């Protein structure tokens, strides 16, 4: 009786939200940006190939100086690369080799990683002893760690396969806030540029916008037909793009609370692993299962170019903060740095 | 053209590269085994004979190092992390023979043996384990022998025309699991009958792993 009545009210509320989004859908982003000229053909060359990982690369993250990056492989090694020289700055042996994510702190003093061991390990890069040591092991998730991102040297957000995201106080080792509401494994998270919000994509094909300080879900974004594997905020923080196993990328707007544009092609039938934006946000770069990275025109939904330089899955990618280059990691154990030439 | 510190930084990277190769060679001598199976299937008893997330077991038998990984604690979606185990030497699958007549506790109407068959079929025919051999352990053979006399095998298999002898009953179950394999050419299934008092289980794994390693070496050397 009471349970049946309540679940009927949820359906009425869902229709109310769907009607509200349709009311403000006066135009389409495609119609708005039809007049502007296309970006043309984007040609990028492999400037660097980072060799040394002996297994599948699962994650990479640029440092904020746009020169150092950290990559994770399931050979149990975290490696920090000098991308300008291809020099290896550090090689961090992992206690558990089943790593799925890695993060570089914005300060550059810490890196984080974790996988099937259900632990987010924080590594101190600046020690008087001259070696990288574990400073914290964040336990508390009951599923695998899928993504992690530093807010500062003391705060980090983790998404897990136990359907929850958590905000951690690194100094005390305790999760201050727990973000619940996903009905599937949360696969990714992205921080807003002001680090007041973050979006997460789960295997329930939905993206939720979370308030870091308040600790609740502000908005829920649906439209994908399969698990979301990747998510990335727009550079101004007012939009985000997702990548799913249904071979599509969608651009959702925070303020309009709805999808604005879909980025898919008939030839593309493989899942999407990673998404990122260029510095101005005009380009959406997506890594795919078909061994390629497709550069999209964000405004016009045109495939601007292809980065074809890997013989296995493109597992991760990232664009520098200055926008100078894009790094692609792959299951073939190589990282490549790309940018164009005049 | 490099500066004094740049040359030192390049030399540090070479030192790191040397240690990465040594770690890769050391990790290449380890046999990685993925341990799978249903609950109450002798999966924990096998680990005892072999002596919060993934559980890793290390043991050495005749100058060969084995790394056995148990992922029974992972209650998340299997497909999101099962590719992480692509490239293991072999998969160890544990099946309780005594659970042929028992009913799964959760469903209360599904036979446990059929539940193991569904788990075996998905893992064996998974796209990430096309070339991965499977070591099949059929535990509780002594308890299965006792249950056969009281309970015929026809309960589990309605289309079973065989007798109630232990040898015929056990062989029929072995063939049913091997018939679930669709990649007969690319992979091979090794089946063994284990008990609580058995001590040859480590020898069977070593023999099955050595056969798998040699076949991979022949494929790498061009003979296969």
């Amino acid at each position, epitope marked *: 009786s009471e349970l049946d009545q309540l679940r009927q009210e949820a359906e009425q509320l869902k229709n109310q939200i769907r009607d509200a989004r349709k009311a403000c859908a006066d135009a389409t982003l495609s119609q708005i940006t039809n007049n502007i000229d296309p970006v043309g053909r984007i040609q990028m060359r492999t400037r660097r190939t980072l060799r040394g990982h002996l297994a599948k690369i699962y994650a990479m993250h640029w440092g904020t100086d746009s*020169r*150092l990056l950290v990559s994770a492989s399931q050979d149990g090694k975290l490696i920090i690369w*000098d991308s300008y*020289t291809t*020099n290896k*700055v*550090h090689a961090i042996p992992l206690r558990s080799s089943w790593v799925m994510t890695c993060a570089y702190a914005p300060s*550059g003093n810490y890196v984080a990683c974790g996988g099937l061991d259900n632990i987010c390990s924080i590594y101190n890069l*600046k020690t*008087r*002893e*001259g*070696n990288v040591r574990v400073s914290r092991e964040l336990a508390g998730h009951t599923g695998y760690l899928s993504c992690c991102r530093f807010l500062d040297d003391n705060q980090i957000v983790t998404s897990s396969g136990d359907t929850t995201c958590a905000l951690w106080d690194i100094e005390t080792g305790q999760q201050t806030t727990t973000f619940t509401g996903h009905t599937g494994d949360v696969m990714s998270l992205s921080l807003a540029p002001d680090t007041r919000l973050f979006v997460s994509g789960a295997c329930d094909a939905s993206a939720k916008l979370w308030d870091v300080r308040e600790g609740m879900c502000r908005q829920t974004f649906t439209g994908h037909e399969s698990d979301i594997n990747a998510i990335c905020f727009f550079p101004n923080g007012n939009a985000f793009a997702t990548g799913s196993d249904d071979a599509t990328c969608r651009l959702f707007d925070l303020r309009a609370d709805q999808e604005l544009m879909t980025y898919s092609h008939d030839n593309i039938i493989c899942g999407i692993t990673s998404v990122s934006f260029s510095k101005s946000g005009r380009l959406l770069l997506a890594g795919y299962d078909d061994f390629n990275c497709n550069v999209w025109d964000a405004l016009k939904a045109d495939r601007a170019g292809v980065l074809a330089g890997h013989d296995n899955r493109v597992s991760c990618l990232g664009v520098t903060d200055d926008g100078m280059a894009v790094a692609t990691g792959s299951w073939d154990s190589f990282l490549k740095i790309w940018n164009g030439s005049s | *053209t490099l*500066s*004094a*510190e*740049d*040359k*030192a*930084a390049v*030399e*540090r990277s*070479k*030192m790191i590269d040397r240690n990465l190769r040594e770690d890769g060679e050391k990790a290449a001598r380890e046999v990685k085994l993925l341990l799978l199976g249903a609950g109450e299937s002798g999966k924990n008893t096998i680990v005892k004979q072999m002596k919060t997330g993934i559980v890793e077991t290390h043991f050495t038998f005749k100058d060969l190092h084995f790394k056995m990984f148990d992922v029974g604690a992972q209650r998340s979606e299997r497909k999101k992390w099962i590719h992480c185990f692509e490239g293991v030497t072999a998969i160890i699958f544990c099946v309780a023979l005594s659970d042929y007549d028992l009913v799964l506790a959760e469903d209360e109407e599904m036979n446990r043996m059929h539940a193991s068959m569904k788990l075996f079929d998905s893992i064996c025919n998974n796209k990430w384990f096309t070339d991965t051999s499977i070591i099949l352990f059929l535990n509780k053979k002594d308890l299965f022998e006792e249950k056969i006399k009281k309970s015929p095998l026809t309960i589990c298999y309605p289309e079973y025309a065989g007798s109630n002898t232990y040898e015929e009953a056990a062989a029929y179950i072995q063939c049913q699991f091997e018939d679930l394999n669709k990649r007969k050419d690319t992979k091979e299934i090794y089946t063994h009958f284990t008990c609580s008092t058995d001590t040859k289980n480590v020898q069977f794994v070593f023999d099955a792993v050595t056969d798998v390693i040699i076949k991979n070496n022949l494929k790498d050397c061009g003979l296969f």
Partner: single-chain antibody
Amino acid sequence: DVQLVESGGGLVQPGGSRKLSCSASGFAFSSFGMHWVRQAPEKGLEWVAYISSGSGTIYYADTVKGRFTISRDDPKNTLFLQMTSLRSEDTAMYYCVRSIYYYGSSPFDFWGQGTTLTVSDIVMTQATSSVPVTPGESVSISCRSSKSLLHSNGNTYLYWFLQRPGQSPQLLIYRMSNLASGVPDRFSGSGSGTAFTLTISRLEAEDVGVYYCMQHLEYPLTFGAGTKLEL
């Protein structure tokens, strides 16, 4: 804590041989390159030798090449300096210096206490030998180089050290602008090309000492004469 203890120094006859040891504790010794730097009594610093991490690269100053041998024992965390044919020119305090090299590292950050031995090229100029100072007032120290210390990679390999009376040198500024860990922000390094300035805002009693500018553009590493601050 990070420690570097030197031993084996003492009074030796001219033409003799002596073995200096530097035992390291509290840090990953095998990861650091090591230098020997000596300082003659009432004189400035003089670089002696260098052995890299992994023992692959070894450098010597011309004045000691062929007579000194530098070696390390990574399992024992010991740094060695085998000296032969010792001359009266070798009478100095020999310092053991650790230095790690990667992008953004701070070489020459920790020095040992030193051991005293008594026997019976880019030019770095610090013309001002001494500067009378008062607490709370801003002081600037100038250094010059015969060659441009700015490399084509954008780094300017100029270092600033402070040797307080009775103490080993400590790193203040590395690569001409960066502030070493544990150094107050009042110190600031400014330079261009061949001319460099170390500015000390709100001078305190602890800042009193000799300041050395070192170039790390190429070997041999050379020090300035040193500028002394006195009250």
